[PDB]
Structures are given as C-alpha cells and as structure tokens.
Design a protein around this nucleic acid. Structure first.
Ligand SMILES: Nc1ncnc2c1ncn2[C@@H]1O[C@H](COP(=O)(O)OP(=O)(O)OP(=O)(O)O)[C@@H](O)[C@H]1O
Ligand SMILES: Nc1ncnc2c1ncn2[C@@H]1O[C@H](COP(=O)(O)OP(=O)(O)OP(=O)(O)O)[C@@H](O)[C@H]1O
Ligand SMILES: Nc1ncnc2c1ncn2[C@@H]1O[C@H](COP(=O)(O)OP(=O)(O)OP(=O)(O)O)[C@@H](O)[C@H]1O
Ligand SMILES: [Mg+2]
Ligand SMILES: [Mg+2]
Ligand SMILES: [Mg+2]
Ligand SMILES: [Zn+2]
Lengths: 202, 349, 615
DNA sequence: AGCAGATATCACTCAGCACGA
DNA sequence: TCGTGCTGAGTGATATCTGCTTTGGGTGGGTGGGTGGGTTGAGGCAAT
C-alpha cells in the first residue's frame, strides 16, 4: 500500500506548557488570520465534554455544536476543512448535495450483488466525532427534521422496507451558513439573516 | 419491384413553360396567390410560405461556421384564423413534409428512438419526426401546448440542425436540416393589444429568436371584411366534384406507368427552382439590406419582435429565396426590397 | 461437391511469389533484407507492398517473360495469399547472422526433445504457424502508382460503410470513417499445446474459429500401441497467442444520404497493428472483408444470414502580440477587444499554486459572459473551445475538461444538479462519484467558460444587476472575471456590423484588410510556451497590489451603498487579481511581475463590468 | 455436435477334472 | 502334491448404439420465475 511511552511523555510535556491554549488555537488554523475566538470554540468542540450515562435520569449529551454564519467573503469553509483534517472521526457534507453520501440512513439496493442493504448516513458515520456541514442554508425539510432529531435524541430511527432499527448518532455538528442576500445586514436580527427556523438555531 | 410514388419528371415543354412564366414581372404575386385558393386573405403569410418552400442557399465556411438556408415561420393568433388549414396545405404541397402536434409528440419521438432489429437482433436507431423530415419541412400544430422537456429537442434541432444521441452505448450525430413552420395561440387565447408581446406569448425568447418570421394575425370585426369572408366561405361550401350528382356523398389502372397556377405546375416550378438555381449576392442588394437593417434596428417605433443580428441573416435568406423565385443567378435590388417589405410587415404590421 | 474449372493455377502464383521475394530490387533485394532482419529477431512484422508487385509484373512484361497478374489475384482473394506468402517466406528464410540464446525459448527445447524422441523411436511434426515469429500484412495499391501503369486501384479507393456490400466479401478494400469504440488488447489463441501424463509426449491443436473443443484423450503412437489411456491437459506456457483488438468504425456525416441513419462496421486487429486505432480518429482502414460463420446450434438456428468484419491490414491516419492574438481569436466577429483579451487570459491561465499549507488558491481564471441575445456568444464559445487543446463544448464532459477550460453554453438553463457539480468543480476541484456500482474520485482542476442570458431574456436597466442574474450570488462572486455584453443600437456600429456580415456572406472571407491575422498554429504553440512558463513576484509589487486592494475595497463599498454595484470586492477579488497578473507575466515571458501587468489586470477588471454598466 | 443412458457382445477368473509323477 | 490342457458358466467391462437440447427470443410458454438475462418509452399514480 502506497501510542508509546515516548508519545505519552511528549503529551504530558506539552500539557505542562503554560501557553497550551494559545498554542493549540494557533496550531488548529495556521492559515486563518484573526479569528482567535472561533478557533478557541472549535478547539473546545473538538475536545468535547463528558458523556454522562445516568441511572434514573437518562442520557445527557457532552457534545458541542457551533454554527459559523456571516458574510461569504470571510473564510468559513477552510475552517471546516481544517476541522475535518484534525478530527479523528468525521465526514464532510453539504446540504442538498448529491455528491455526499447523505445525512440520514436509507435503504438501498446493492447493484453489484442485487441485494437489499441498509446504508448509514453521514451523521451515523460520525458517531463520536465532528460532522461538518458546509451549506446549512439550503437543505430539505426532511433533512432538517432528521437534523433536529439527531440534535435532540442523538439517534436516528428508520421504519421502512420492513426494517425497524435505531442507529446511534452521538456526533457533534459544525455547520456553516450564509445570509439571504449578498451580505449580512446588521440592522435585522440574526434569525432573519441566517434564514433558519428559530428552533433549529436555538 | 419498388416503384416510388416524390419527384415529378420535367419535360421540355414543362421547362419552357416554367421559364416563360418566370419571365413575368409579377410571378411572385401569381405564385403566392396560387397557394391555398380556398383561404381568403393572408397574402403575406402565403408569400412567406412560398419563400420557405423555395428556401435559401446553405453555405458552410471553411473555418467551420454553418449558415442554414432554411426559413422558419411562426404564426400566433386568435382562434379560427386559418393557421391549421395553412399548415395542412403546406403539408400537402411540399414534396417532403411531416405533421406533428403539440400534445401528440414527445422528445424521443421527435429526435430518434433506440430499438432492436428483428432480422439481426442488433441495437439501432429509429428516425424521428425531425430526422425523417431531413431536407424537408416539419409542421408543428399547437406549438404552445407542448412541454419544456419536449421543447428542448426542438430547440437543439433548430439551433444546430443536428441531433445528438447518447443512449444504450450509441454515440452518433443525425442530420436534421428541415424548415419549421408552426402555429400557436396566445396565453389568454386571444391577442390583447394593451399587453406587451412578451406577456401574450409564453414561449421562451431563445426559442422565439430562431424563427425568421413571426406573424401575428387577429380576428377583427369589420362589415366589409366580414361580408367578403362570409361570401367566400359560402361559395367554397357550394363546390361539387366532377362526376357527382347533387346530394351524393363523397366517397389504379396501371402500376409501372392574374390567372391561378395549378398545384402540379406549382410543384414542378418549385422543384425546378430549388434544384437548378443558386442565387449569388451582389453589391446593390447588400446596400439595400444594410440600409434597411440600420433603419429598422435604431427606430423609435416599437416592434412586435426585437431586432437582432439574426434579422440581417433573415433578410439575406429572404432575398435569396426571392431570387430563386425568378430563376435568377444573382440577387438584385428587387429581391432586397421585397424581403425588406415582408420583414417590415411581419414586424410592425 | 461438384467441381468447377477456374482460370487460376496456384502453383504458378506460388512460383511468382517466390521469384518476387527472391529477386525483386528497389544493394540486395529489399524483402531478402527484411527476412534477414526478421531472422535476427529485429523485426516482427513484414508488409508486402502491392506497388512492388505491380512494378515487378511490369518489368517481367517488359523483359518479354509475361507472368500472371498477381496484384489482381491478391486483391480478389487475399485470405489464401496470406498463407501462400507465409509459406514462401518460410521456404526461403535465411540463416541467422547474430547468435541468439536458443535454449532460453521453451519451444526450441520442446521441439528438440520431440526430435530426440522421434530419433529414438525410429532407431527401435508441428504446425508451421507454431514457430512463426512474424506477421504478414498487405499494403494497398497506391493510386499514383496505379495511374502511372494505367490500372485501377480498387483496394486503395476509399469506401463508406454503405458501399461495402456482400459482393465485396473476400477482397482487399479500404474503409473511411471515424472510430467510435476500441476494446482492450486480449490474447487470441492460435495453437494449443497439450501434455500426456503417461506418455510424456506433447500434442498440438490449431484454432481457426470462434470456438474450439479441447482434446481429452491422447493420440500418440506410444499410447495407442500400449493401450494406455492418458488424459490431455492444456499448457499455456507453450501455446501461441496473438494480440487481439475489436474496433467499431462509423460513417462520417457527409457520407450518409438524406434522411438516413449512420451505420457501423466491425474491425478486427491482429498482431502488431494493435493500438493503432483509438476512438475519435478519422482513419483509412485497409483490410480483408470476411464473414464470421457461427458454430453449433447457433449456426443451424441463424440460417444463411452471416456476420462480417474487417481484418485490419493497414491504417492511414488523417491530420503588440496581445492585440494580434486577441484579434485573431475570432476574426469573423466584430471587434470586441476586451472580451478577446479576457479569453486569452482564461486560455493561458498562468498561476503559481503552491501554498502547501493545506489548500492552494485556485489556479483557474474562470470567465463568465452574460448578455442579451444578438452578441456572438456562441461564436466566442466555439472558437475559444476549438483553439484550446482540452476545450470541451457542452450545452446546459467535465472529465474531458480536466486540467483545461470548460466551454459551457446556455449556462443559466443548466439544471440544479449540474449547478452543484460545477460548484464542487470550482470550490474543491474534485469529481466524486458515490454509487453502489462504483466509487471513483477523479481530480478536476478545470476552468469554466460560461454563457448565460438575463432572467427576462434581455438585460433590464431598471432592475439591479443581481436581479437580472438568476444564478446564486455566491457563484457570481466565485467567478474571477464577469463580462457583461449588451447590444446598444447606433447608426455607426449597426452600419459597420451589417457591412461586415454582408462581406462575409458574399466573399466567404474576412473583410478586414488593415492587419493580417496571426496563424492559429503559432498562437497555440505560443500559448503552450506561456503555460510552461512560471513567473515570480516581489515585495514591492505585493505592496502595490495591497494598496490597489484597499482602494478597490473602499470604492466597492461606496458603490454597494447604492444598488447599482454588482457586488462588494472580497479577498476572492484579490486572489483573482494576482492570478490575472501571473497570467499576464506568463504572457510577457519575463519572470518578474511588472506593475504594468497589474495595471492591465485592474483595467480589465474595471472594463469587464463597469464600462458597459455605465453605458 | 456434443453428452448421458443403455444394450449386447466381447473376454477373463476361479473352478475342477483326467493323466503321470 | 506340479503341469497341462479341456470345459464352463459365471462375472464381469469396455467397446459399442439410442435420444435429447441446446442458442437465447417470443417461429416453447405465463400452472418454470422476476435475485439467470433482456430494458428503453409511454403511461398512470401518489407525494409534493
Ligand atoms: N482571516 C482570513 N485569513 C485568510 N484568508 C481569509 C480570511 N478571511 C477570508 N479569507 C479568504 O477568503 C476566501 C474565502 O474562501 P472560502 O472557501 O472559505 O469561502 P466561503 O466561506 O465558503 O464562501 P461562500 O459563502 O461565498 O461560499 C479564501 O480565499 C480565504 O483565503
Ligand atoms: N380566411 C379564411 N377563409 C376561409 N375559411 C376560413 C378562414 N379562416 C378560417 N376559416 C375556417 O376556419 C375553420 C376552422 O379554422 P382553423 O382550424 O383553420 O383555425 P386555426 O387557425 O387552426 O385556429 P385554432 O387552432 O386556434 O382554433 C376552417 O374550416 C376554415 O374553413
Ligand atoms: N458581432 C457579430 N458579427 C457578426 N455576426 C454576429 C455578431 N454577433 C452575432 N452575430 C450573429 O448572430 C447570430 C446569432 O447569434 P449567436 O448564436 O452567435 O449568439 P447569441 O445571440 O448570444 O445566442 P443565443 O440566441 O443562443 O443566446 C449568429 O449567426 C452570428 O452570426
Ligand atoms: Mg463555504
Ligand atoms: Mg388549429
Ligand atoms: Mg448562444
Ligand atoms: Zn500419451
């Protein structure tokens, strides 16, 4: 085809460094200029919170979701590409994109074998990682409902083709958005500019 | 044996008669009037149909640019204006002609269908409406009752005069060099003078621009015209065929075998002119054409169709067709004047 | 099997062939030298020139020893003469002059051991094609030679697929057309070698059909005698194979009659001619038209109807600088200097894309043309696509455009799926396929040329530029340069346009005579040279570009305060400016980027949109 | 044309006895 | 208890004849199946 003790020692030495936060923020996005706060938020999302498995309470999610909205001139897709390059697990997707595998699980036919196969979506494949959605603005209603379910229950349920199954989707989301027009108008509120439902944006 | 039933043999007497008739100054008027004697009026549309039948000269340049000699005609008007009857007449008179409807046709049925050969069991192509009518005329009725899916095929046909097929491992280009004559109705079903031309006709502007001439015909109520049309229709409806008694409803021997011009003679004339004449342009016709184009394009008066560089090509094509009408080897000032008059009537009425 | 008396004597023809091979001269004999080369393993293909045969016949007739017409006999029935010539060559093969490692070849050892076994048996054989190490082909009779000797050259006369009828079967004919399909090279078996587990002997089989039945039982003398039942097992090491390729040739457009569909004819390529035909090339394939009989139950069920193919034998393959280049791009159109310069900049596409930090600035100077009907958008598209080596013309194919400009017509009418495809092409420069059937990702660093019409068909001055454009604002922003073309009536311009068109129609040539257009070949090779070139920029020019950027940003913000502005300047506009400057430097053939190039790029940017909008 | 099932006519093994040794 | 035939019918065996069926395509069908292939075009339907 074309972790060791020393690695742990190096990790501990790096952690002992005083300016570790700034170092990690700089290392995440060397080519992006003057977005320290966004880089810090991205770093914190990458590390993620603690997953709690509660008896009597249920499940509390430790993931962090960040929305990157603003003018189109600024660098927003490069940040997503960097996050993909850094995250151990994740998938790149754009809403309403035929090239991408898809955001939701679906039942398909194996052309190769003429067999029925249940294929998992991008969100499912990102379990435990960061799923970057490049174009959040343009998206199907169905896809929006699936995103809401994933960000609410953290599982995807399908009851089609005679199959009743639930797939784990414990993954973080880092989406990007653009305004309705050629620019974001400061006078109007963010909800109007981004053109997304208040529920999904909250 | 296989006996064709398409090209009429020309005799020396027929050729001499054709030449003698062509030498008349008003040959164009007589020939235009001889088309569809049962249709009252529509003289300009008849002239346009005659010029379309005669057709221009097709020139292909060395660099690769291809200039078609076919003339396309579109008629948009109110109901009961003799558009369908004109289409039927041009279907009957033209040597090669194919009739299609808006709602009766499909994209595949127009271009070509992939099928299998019984004899050989080999995947092949079946010619469509467009293909079948190569070097002929295709009459499309109810042009506005179509679908965009279907419209795309036609758009490609007129724009390139060729058919491109990519199906079932078939990669080929089919020659489709046919003149398109079509009839359509306004969106409201009746032309409205107040509303602009764009609103009246729903067809795409790109598709519209390919038609050399656009004729807008409206049914106007006038006592004199109404009386004339009614009398003409009543006279036509009283016709009886030879060898038939009054009240009798209308029902081969061998195999090998200002006066109106009879249809067979018209067909012979058209064949002769389209076969043995290739008019060439001259300087005077060019001066007239450029003067007319400059005057029409930059003029305050509104036009039912926008002026464009395609109008210059349309003028040249009409001049060439009129030259063909007279059996003249060169395009003269008369041809340019006639083409300019026809275009001006079609544009500004 | 009733017999016929035909006026052909194959013995005399074989003598003729042997005499021609031995004696013909055109130093020593040409074909004797060719056979000597073949013996030393220097040549693996022998081509018989019918012109040589005709000349030899003419010389023999002149000398008074008139001989049979060999050219006509070869042309009328070429399948037999291939074998006849092979036999003649074998009977007169010269001894090798360069020592070779005989023991290396498996066939040599096997035949030597068969000879030893035969000698042992006597003390108490193989097909000729097996040992042949050459291929024989017939070169058609050239028209010039035939006319020199007062003869008709049927073989070399081009024919269409339709003109190839059933009466041409078994003859040497030429076909003119365009190759539409070529298959992969595969080994076709000619002689099969078997082995006996018990005997220890080798058996051989000749294949001259689509299908064959393998041997099962030993036929050796030893086996027969001893009554030993030994099974035969196929051995691919000692078998003989020949490269095989199947191609499809289709009729040219000018050859099809009126109201007819083109037809195709199969072609079979054997020996060293493989890989001589590729899709899309117009060729003059010379071969032997032969039938392909069926076998077994198919044969019985088919009937008398026969398939046909062509055995390929010969293949003939058919064939102030800025202002000058711009004017020579499309002489037939009325002068549009700025658009032509933009097209040159797109075509050359000079850029330095080596960031190495994870991404790299796009290396394509994309151009989009939008205007009301009447401008020669189609003509610019076709011309610029023709000149480009990788230019691809499509109507609303990307793979063919990889590392090259894409010529897209009717851009606005394109479907949304293709819009997303081109969006992926621009932002990511990658083509991705996600299907059950296959999953392949091909890189696509291809530029795009787009032609579109306004929303209403014609530009409306009242509406803002964004309103007239149906495409998403992001796509417009991503375009490096956007040129807006409009048709404004005017006496002078209309008169000149009409005069130009009329002159073109009459004289079928460019009316302009003030300047002589540059030759297209020179222009394309100059473009290639410029592409091969790599420029470089300094810090002072960088600071100048920064200053120009701040000025442009302020001006664009002030303009966008009103609704007339197409859009605010963005860092994408910067990157486009540097890309244009690098392309212009590549044009100049000077490594250092000069301030003049930056100023020219800025003026091009201004005149692409503002020049026409202000009008 | 090739393949699988079947018929029938082809030999070969153990069987055993008469002479004499 | 060895050697040499003569008898012999039994137990094979192998050299030797008698009937499908097939390709693929409706010149075998839909009480052989549609996951063994064909298969692009028109048509009607529901969710959109
Ligand atoms: N802070 C920054 N540092 C470096 N480059 C930047 C910065 N802000 C913007 N850019 C440049 O802006 C351009 C933005 O490109 P990018 O692919 O990120 O766009 P985008 O956010 O996807 O745009 P759109 O909304 O139009 O699709 C890139 O050339 C990037 O170099
Ligand atoms: N100028 C005319 N002279 C004689 N008959 C006419 C004339 N105009 C219309 N008609 C009569 O109209 C009848 C039907 O009209 P026709 O089918 O020709 O209309 P059309 O132009 O195709 O209109 P539409 O398709 O919109 O209804 C024909 O039988 C013809 O007799
Ligand atoms: N400057 C010009 N000089 C000469 N002929 C021209 C010129 N501009 C346009 N034409 C003519 O205009 C005719 C039609 O226009 P063309 O197809 O070239 O482009 P377009 O109008 O942009 O096309 P579309 O109608 O498909 O949007 C062409 O035959 C071409 O000959
Ligand atoms: Mg983006
Ligand atoms: Mg009608
Ligand atoms: Mg165009
Ligand atoms: Zn053997």
């Amino acid at each position: 085809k074309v972790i060791t003790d020393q690695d742990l020692a190096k990790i501990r030495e790096v952690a002992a460094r005083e300016d570790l936060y700034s170092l990690l923020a700089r290392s995440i996005a060397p080519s992006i200029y003057e977005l320290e706060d966004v880089k810090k938020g991205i770093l914190l999302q990458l590390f993620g919170g603690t997953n709690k498995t509660f008896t009597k309470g249920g499940r509390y999610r430790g993931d962090i979701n960040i929305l990157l909205c603003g003018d189109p001139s600024t660098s927003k897709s490069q940040i997503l590409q960097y996050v993909h390059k850094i995250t151990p697990r994740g998938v790149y997707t754009s809403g309403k994109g035929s090239s991408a595998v898809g955001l939701t699980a679906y039942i398909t036919r194996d052309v190769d074998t003429k067999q029925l196969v249940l294929e998992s979506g991008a969100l499912v494949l990102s379990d435990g990682g960061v799923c970057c959605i490049d174009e959040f603005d343009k998206m199907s209603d169905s896809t929006r409902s699936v995103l809401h379910e994933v960000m609410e229950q953290q599982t995807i349920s399908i009851a089609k083709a005679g199959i009743i199954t639930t797939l784990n989707a414990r993954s973080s989301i880092l989406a990007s958005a653009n305004p309705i027009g050629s620019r974001y108008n400061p006078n109007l509120p963010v909800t109007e500019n981004i053109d997304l439902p208040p529920p999904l944006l909250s | 044996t296989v006996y064709p039933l398409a090209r009429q043999m020309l005799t020396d007497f027929d050729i001499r008669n054709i030449n003698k008739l062509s030498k008349k100054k008003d040959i164009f008027d007589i020939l235009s009037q001889s088309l569809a004697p049962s249709i009252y009026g529509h003289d300009h549309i008849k002239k346009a149909i005659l010029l379309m039948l005669m057709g221009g000269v097709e020139k292909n340049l060395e660099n690769g640019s291809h200039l078609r000699g076919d003339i396309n005609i579109l008629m948009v008007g109110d109901p009961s204006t003799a558009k369908s009857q004109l289409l039927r007449f041009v279907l009957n008179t033209a040597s090669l002609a194919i009739a299609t409807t808006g709602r009766g046709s499909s994209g595949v049925g127009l271009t070509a269908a992939v099928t299998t050969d019984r004899e050989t069991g080999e995947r092949r192509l079946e010619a469509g409406a467009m293909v079948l009518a190569d070097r002929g005329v295709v009459c499309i009725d109810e042009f506005d009752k179509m679908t965009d899916v279907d419209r795309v095929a036609i758009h490609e046909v007129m724009e390139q005069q060729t058919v491109t097929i990519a199906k079932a491992g078939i990669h080929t280009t089919l020659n489709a060099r046919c003149s398109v004559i079509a009839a359509a109705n306004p969106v409201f079903g009746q032309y409205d003078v107040n509303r602009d031309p764009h609103q009246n006709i729903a067809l795409p502007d790109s598709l519209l621009s390919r038609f050399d001439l656009l004729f807008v015909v409206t049914d106007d109520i006038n006592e004199i015209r109404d009386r004339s049309i009614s009398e003409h229709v009543l006279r036509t409806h009283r016709y009886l065929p030879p060898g038939y008694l009054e009240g009798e409803p209308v029902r081969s021997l061998a195999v090998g075998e200002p006066k109106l011009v009879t249809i067979p003679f018209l067909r012979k004339y058209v064949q002769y002119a389209k076969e043995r004449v290739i008019p060439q342009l001259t300087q005077e016709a060019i001066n007239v054409i450029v003067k007319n184009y400059t005057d029409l394009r930059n003029d305050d008066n509104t036009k039912k169709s926008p002026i464009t560089a395609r109008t210059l090509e349309t003028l040249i094509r009409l001049a060439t067709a009129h030259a063909k009408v007279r059996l003249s080897k060169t395009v003269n000032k008369v041809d340019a004047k006639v083409a300019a008059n026809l275009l001006r009537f079609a544009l500004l009425g | 099997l009733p017999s016929i008396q035909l006026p052909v004597d194959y013995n005399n023809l074989f003598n003729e062939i042997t005499d021609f091979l031995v004696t013909f001269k055109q130093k020593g004999p040409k074909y004797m030298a060719m056979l000597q080369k073949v013996a030393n393993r220097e040549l693996n293909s022998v081509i018989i020139d019918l012109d040589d045969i005709l000349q030899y016949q003419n010389e023999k007739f002149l000398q008074g020893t008139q001989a049979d017409d060999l050219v006509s006999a070869i042309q009328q029935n070429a399948n037999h003469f291939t074998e006849l010539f092979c036999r003649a060559i074998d009977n007169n093969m010269p001894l090798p002059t360069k020592e070779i490692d005989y023991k290396d070849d498996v066939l040599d050892v096997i035949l030597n051991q068969r000879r030893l076994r035969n000698e042992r048996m006597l003390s108490d054989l193989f097909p000729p094609n097996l040992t042949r190490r050459y291929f024989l082909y017939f070169k058609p009779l050239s028209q010039n030679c035939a006319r020199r000797y007062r003869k008709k050259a049927i073989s070399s006369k081009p024919l269409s697929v339709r003109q190839i009828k059933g009466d041409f079967l078994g003859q040497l004919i030429t076909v003119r057309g365009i190759i539409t399909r070529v298959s992969d090279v595969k080994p076709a078996v000619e002689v099969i070698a078997y082995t006996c587990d018990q005997c220890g002997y080798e058996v051989f089989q000749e294949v001259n059909s689509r299908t064959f039945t393998p041997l099962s039982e030993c036929t050796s003398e030893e086996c027969s005698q001893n009554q030993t039942k030994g099974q035969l097992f196929m051995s691919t090491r000692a078998s003989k194979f020949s490269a095989f390729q199947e191609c499809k040739i289709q009729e040219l457009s000018q050859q099809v009659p009126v109201g007819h569909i083109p037809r195709s004819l199969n072609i079979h390529v054997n020996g060293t001619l493989v890989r001589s035909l590729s899709p899309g090339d117009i060729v003059d394939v010379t071969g032997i038209f032969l039938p392909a009989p069926y076998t077994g139950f198919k044969a019985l069920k088919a009937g008398l109807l026969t398939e046909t193919y062509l055995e390929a034998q010969f293949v003939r393959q058919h064939k102030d600088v800025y202002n000058r280049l711009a004017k020579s791009i499309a002489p037939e159109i009325y002068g549009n200097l700025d658009v032509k310069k933009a097209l040159l900049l797109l075509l050359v596409g000079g850029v330095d894309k080596r960031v190495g930090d994870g991404m790299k600035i796009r290396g394509d100077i994309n151009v989009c043309l939008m205007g009301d009907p009447g401008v020669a958008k189609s003509q610019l598209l076709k011309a610029i696509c023709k000149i480009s080596p990788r230019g691809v013309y499509t109507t609303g194919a990307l793979v063919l455009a990889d590392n090259g400009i894409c010529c897209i017509d009717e851009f606005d009418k394109m479907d949304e799926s293709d819009r997303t495809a081109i969006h992926e092409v621009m932002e990511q420069q990658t083509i991705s396929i996600s299907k059950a059937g296959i999953n392949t990702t091909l890189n696509a660093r291809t530029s795009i040329l787009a032609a579109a019409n306004p929303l209403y068909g014609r530009y409306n001055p009242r509406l803002s530029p964004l309103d007239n454009i149906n495409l998403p604002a992001a796509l417009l922003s991503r375009f490096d340069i956007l040129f807006l073309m409009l048709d404004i009536p005017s006496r002078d311009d209309d008169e000149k346009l009409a005069e130009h068109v009329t002159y073109v129609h009459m004289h079928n040539k460019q009316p302009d005579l003030d300047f002589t257009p540059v030759e297209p070949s020179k222009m394309r090779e100059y473009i290639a040279y410029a592409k091969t070139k790599r420029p470089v920029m300094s810090e002072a020019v960088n600071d100048y570009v920064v200053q120009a950027y701040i000025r442009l940003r302020q001006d664009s913000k002030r303009e966008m305060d009103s609704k007339f502005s197409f859009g605010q300047a963005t860092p994408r506009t910067l990157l486009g400016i540097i890309r244009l400057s690098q392309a212009l430097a590549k044009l100049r053939l000077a490594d250092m980027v000069d301030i003049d190039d930056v100023e020219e790029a800025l003026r091009l940017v201004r005149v692409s949109k503002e020049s026409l909008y202000q009008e």
